[PDB]
Symmetry: C6
Subunit: 201 residues, 6 copies
Amino acid sequence: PIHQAISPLTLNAWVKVVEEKAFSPEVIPMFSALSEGATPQDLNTMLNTVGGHQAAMQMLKETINEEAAEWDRLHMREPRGSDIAGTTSTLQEQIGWMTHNPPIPVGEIYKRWIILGLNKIVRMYSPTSILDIRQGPKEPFRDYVDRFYKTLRAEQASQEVKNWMTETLLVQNANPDCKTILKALGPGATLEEMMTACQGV
Amino acid sequence: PIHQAISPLTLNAWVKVVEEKAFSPEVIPMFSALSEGATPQDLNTMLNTVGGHQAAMQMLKETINEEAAEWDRLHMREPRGSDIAGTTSTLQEQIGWMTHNPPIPVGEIYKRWIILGLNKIVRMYSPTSILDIRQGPKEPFRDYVDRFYKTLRAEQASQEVKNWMTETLLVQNANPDCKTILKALGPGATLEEMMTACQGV
Amino acid sequence: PIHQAISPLTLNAWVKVVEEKAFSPEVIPMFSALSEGATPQDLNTMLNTVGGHQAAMQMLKETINEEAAEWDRLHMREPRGSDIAGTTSTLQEQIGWMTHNPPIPVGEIYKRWIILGLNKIVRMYSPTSILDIRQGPKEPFRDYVDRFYKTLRAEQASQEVKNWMTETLLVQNANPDCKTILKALGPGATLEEMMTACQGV
Amino acid sequence: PIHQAISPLTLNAWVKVVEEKAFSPEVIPMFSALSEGATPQDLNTMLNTVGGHQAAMQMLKETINEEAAEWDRLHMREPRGSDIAGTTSTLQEQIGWMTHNPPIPVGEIYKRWIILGLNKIVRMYSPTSILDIRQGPKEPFRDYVDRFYKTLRAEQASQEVKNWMTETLLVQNANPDCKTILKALGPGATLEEMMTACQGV
Amino acid sequence: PIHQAISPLTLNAWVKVVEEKAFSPEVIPMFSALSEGATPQDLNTMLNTVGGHQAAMQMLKETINEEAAEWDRLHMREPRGSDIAGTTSTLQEQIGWMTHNPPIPVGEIYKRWIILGLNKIVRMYSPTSILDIRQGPKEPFRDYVDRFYKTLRAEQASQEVKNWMTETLLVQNANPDCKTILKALGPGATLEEMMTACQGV
Amino acid sequence: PIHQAISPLTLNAWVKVVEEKAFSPEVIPMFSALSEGATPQDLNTMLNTVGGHQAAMQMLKETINEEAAEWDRLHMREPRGSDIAGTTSTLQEQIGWMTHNPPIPVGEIYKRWIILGLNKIVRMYSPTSILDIRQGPKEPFRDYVDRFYKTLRAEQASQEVKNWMTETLLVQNANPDCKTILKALGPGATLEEMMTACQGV
């Protein structure tokens, strides 16, 4: 990235993460950490290298096409949608644009589109919905909380709904004894206080 | 590549990929990502190192000979076919040509020929044809789509035929229940909509 | 860190340590050794990458919110709490602040907050309390001391209480024979003297 | 090589290749790719490090002696055979010669001699001769071609004989059905055409 | 060390050595080879990272306290004991002292103290004393010598006592036949002569 | 070496080779390839790190003492034996001597002494003598030659004796059939000719 060719120690890491972690919600920060300040011709190389999950990678290409069309409708030379995707642009043109004054972050825009696509694909790949997660009969409370939040991390929503869900839904799905202990704890109890009060059981 | 010798951490990676991934359609982007801005005398070293699959590597040499003959018929000194292949050229001559003003991308041309050869060899190595891929009796729809597109990726064709194949052939090979659900969904349904509507079954 | 992107050889190491060592008390120095002189936008990348233990990572985010609120109440432009956390700041603004004269160590402050959060989370994750650790019937004294101190390392307290605990509590929980040998050794005996006197048994 | 000492990441790779791949015909390009622009005092270090196969490495030393004697008979100071082999020369003398104007490629000459020796040793290590390779009763044609060419790669001969062997001998050793299909295909059929016509069986 | 942060490829190596080799007498040279010209704030990071063996690492801290107290009693600004240990000093102060003219080797002093502590801890961790090592009934003489010297390496003593022990004690503990052969060899026999004379048995 | 500290990627390689390869005759070139242009204070670090084989490493120290005494008897300031060994010299003095004009290769001398010691130790560690190596009843001739030369490599002797041994002793120990075939081949037969004539059996 920003010129020098992308090192094989990065492509192998990206391929290995996608192969092993599947599309768990932690793939998105890994993608944004591996490719920093990269031209679109590097994200394309980073995306085509993924061996399996071609059906879920075409869906990411559909999303790229939609965003490119929206930018093209909205709008050196003018950067159009097919130029942001890096499929109708030369390496010299992109590097000159990224080093121009003022610079146009074509790579940054493509990275943002990929992040949107990855958010949507991971959202679909979530196994089950939050309302289906229920506390087990004999299960440590730390395990239950660390499963509930892992499920909630995949879904994305506005802070008002999520804040309501974390505060109230969590205490609703507990077993009778844990529900009584949470109720006895009372309102305004932070997560640490809830877990440390109910850690004995 | 562009002068410095190619690092062993790249030859080992290229050999290991070809040995393990065989000629799955993801080998082509890996080849184009490992060797960037490389002289033809580096692609030759990257090709001879492949241990097995010598029959499919001679076919890549036949394709190189055909393309070299076509360029020689079409046409410092003049770059002929035997000079593009790097077998009748000196390292000093190639480096001088690649640093000359204007530069002649002899390495780029050889890389393009190898990409054409790799496309043809992978096309032959595809196990079965698209029309043979049929949905199973009890099989998740995501699995079926991610097998159908993996098979379709190997074949290369014009966008008009492929667009027709992806839109219509996919809905033709489904089982009666999935075919009914797809038909009830109606025209203009994108891939994400099809999969999310039929994900319940 | 301090500009250049964080190498993947560091993110993989941090993820692997947290995955394997869990939250044993040695994670805190590992975290402070991996990220030196790093902008807050690097600690965020280092924290989001952790796959599991999301419940214990949200608690670290609650602690970050509390510390950010306290700083905001206490107080280029003024660095507020949401700016220290790196969620409402640009990379250019942070780098300029960290290279400004005089420099404001926003990254250092965030690192200190994370260290406080990590201390609290590890303190909670300690399996059992010191008073529950008792010497076994037939157990080497070195093993007993190296289990007692490992348990005591997780708990953090003022030096006066800890000095009292190490000097007196250690000799209180021994078996009758080891208690007699420690008493025969007498006051002012350092740890090495205690272990080398009682190493025979 | 060209001054800096040879990195251990190269000696380990060379030792591991020779240990694992034995003397398969792909060792020669690996040797020519690992040591580029290297002084003779580096090839000697790269040759002595090989643990096993000392009998086949002495034969490479016999070949070096023969070539050195021929050069000595044929012919700063004059580079003689014992000087090309690097056993009677100082590092300063070799580096000065390799940086002199005009430079004498003593390292290149030694590398060429080693390549000749390696060609001869691999030729001897070939398991069986081409005429012994016969198509099996029930064997895929791709497997047969990829075994026939692997055997033919070890033997080295003039292009006229090899071209005759590849065109005619290949179609002679086939089974009756494959021989009939090849004959029905007719003259001028390239390797790809032969394999794709007979791939069905 | 001497400014740049310590690479993770060194902390992992140090942790892995201490975890695997335990406190065998070869840990001391490994510690002195990993950290060269390092500030005290790097040795502290290298010491806290050790996961297990906390009891034997507190003893190393007791030794550090003793040496720091002795230096403080013995004695920019004056470097006191709590300043040598790096717990009451800033990174800027230490770097300035280590780059000052004349430079004060605070890091070197801390390294020497750690070496003294490591010598003492390894001395305690030695399994058995030299006088307990006896030659077996049917045991190769090379094995016996290579066990005797490994035990003697852990103990540290003045050269006069050790020279007496190596010359005389070694020949005292042999079996009757080996004792007769050693006696027949006579005085002034070096170790190589003893082993090569008695290697037949 | 020549100033910068020795990388841990070299110490680990040296320790791993000595641990695995034991003292096979290929350890000597590995030692001379790992440490090039190194000060004596680096060879000492490279020697002390070896975990096992302390008996055979003390013998290398005895040899160092003998060579140091001989140099001291034979003879900035004068480099004496205890100064060549690096045990009574400062790093500044050695670096200044190695960068002085004219430079004194104290490191080179120590390296040569270690090579002499390693030759002697490997010579002792050879399992059996050449005269004990006999051809088996049913054994491939290549295997026999590659065992005979491996044994002969450990022993070091003048070229006149070794040339006599390779030419005549090799043909003396063969079985009757191979002895007849070698005799029928006649005088002046090189190793390759002998092996290729007798390779059929």
